[PDB]
């Protein structure tokens, strides 16, 4: 998982590619909006670097001589907020994308088909964000068993673990939907407007990087599917004995 979490840097690379993509359409409120949008986009490296760093911390805590039924999740708690840090930015960029593409529609696009289809693409982008937020609200709630789970519904989140396996596996296809939709969107945008070398310069890296992310999401999906049963079995040692394992700040005393 840590190795697959490293693949998110490719998303960061394409986000920077997306910044220069927007800069390219400046010669082609939007004039202040694009620079403001770009400045907000620069923040992503700061936002996403703790996510991978915290996942590394989770790997550090999962080391042996520790039971880690839910104990190592304390780093996951940091990781959850770190994932929140990613998605906050993604939510930060979500309305900003919608308007920007509309202004990109305001740019000369004589063909209606390109204009309508990129509106569909923005809607698809909205969909991938939505499944991504479902994951984040899930994982943040999954951090609550780590510390003070008042609800104590051990059985419920044993089942709950499956939902991201379904969500993530579908998310692989949803990312593929972005990829295929973007493939002709970038191709057509390359074809008709001028500055073809710049268009190829932005398009080749964004298209290949998104395909690499789809590969990364596929790895995450395959990974989660194989290890989903192991995690559900891992969380619950025995019937009514899962809650004793999840009892707050006793397990820390038990590690001591």
């Amino acid at each position: 998982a840590l190795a697959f979490v490293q693949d998110l840097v490719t998303a960061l690379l394409n986000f920077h590619t997306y910044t220069e993509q927007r800069i390219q359409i400046f010669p082609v409120t939007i004039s202040p909006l694009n620079q403001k949008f770009s400045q907000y986009l620069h923040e992503n490296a700061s936002y996403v670097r703790p996510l991978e760093e915290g996942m590394l911390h989770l790997f550090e805590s999962i080391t042996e001589d520790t039971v880690t039924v839910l104990e190592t999740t304390v780093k996951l708690k940091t990781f959850s907020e770190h994932l929140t840090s990613y998605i906050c930015f993604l939510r930060k960029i979500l309305p900003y994308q919608l308007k920007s593409l509309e202004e990109e529609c305001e740019s000369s696009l004589c063909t209606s088909a390109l204009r309508a289809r990129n509106l569909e693409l923005s809607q698809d982008m909205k969909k991938m964000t939505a499944v991504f937020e479902k994951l984040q609200t899930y994982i943040a709630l999954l951090a609550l068993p780590s510390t003070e789970p008042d609800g104590l519904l051990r059985t419920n989140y044993s089942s709950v673990l499956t939902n991201v396996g379904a969500a993530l596996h579908g998310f692989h296809d949803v990312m593929k939907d972005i990829s295929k939709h973007y493939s002709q969107k970038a191709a057509i945008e390359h074809e008709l407007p001028t500055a073809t070398q710049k268009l190829i310069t932005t398009n080749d890296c964004i298209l290949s990087s998104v395909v690499a992310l789809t590969n990364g999401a596929g790895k995450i999906a395959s990974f989660f599917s194989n290890n989903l049963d192991y995690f559900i079995a891992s969380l619950s040692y025995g019937p009514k004995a899962a809650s004793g394992f999840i009892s707050p700040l006793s397990a820390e005393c038990m590690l001591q």
């Binding site: 409120t29 202040p32 909006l33 403001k36 309305p95 900003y96 308007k99």
Partner: peptide, 13 residues
């Protein structure tokens, strides 16, 4: 208020 409200008749700064 929203970004959507702001971009219409904007005066951005």
């Amino acid at each position: 208020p929203s970004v959507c409200e702001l971009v219409r008749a904007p005066g951005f700064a």
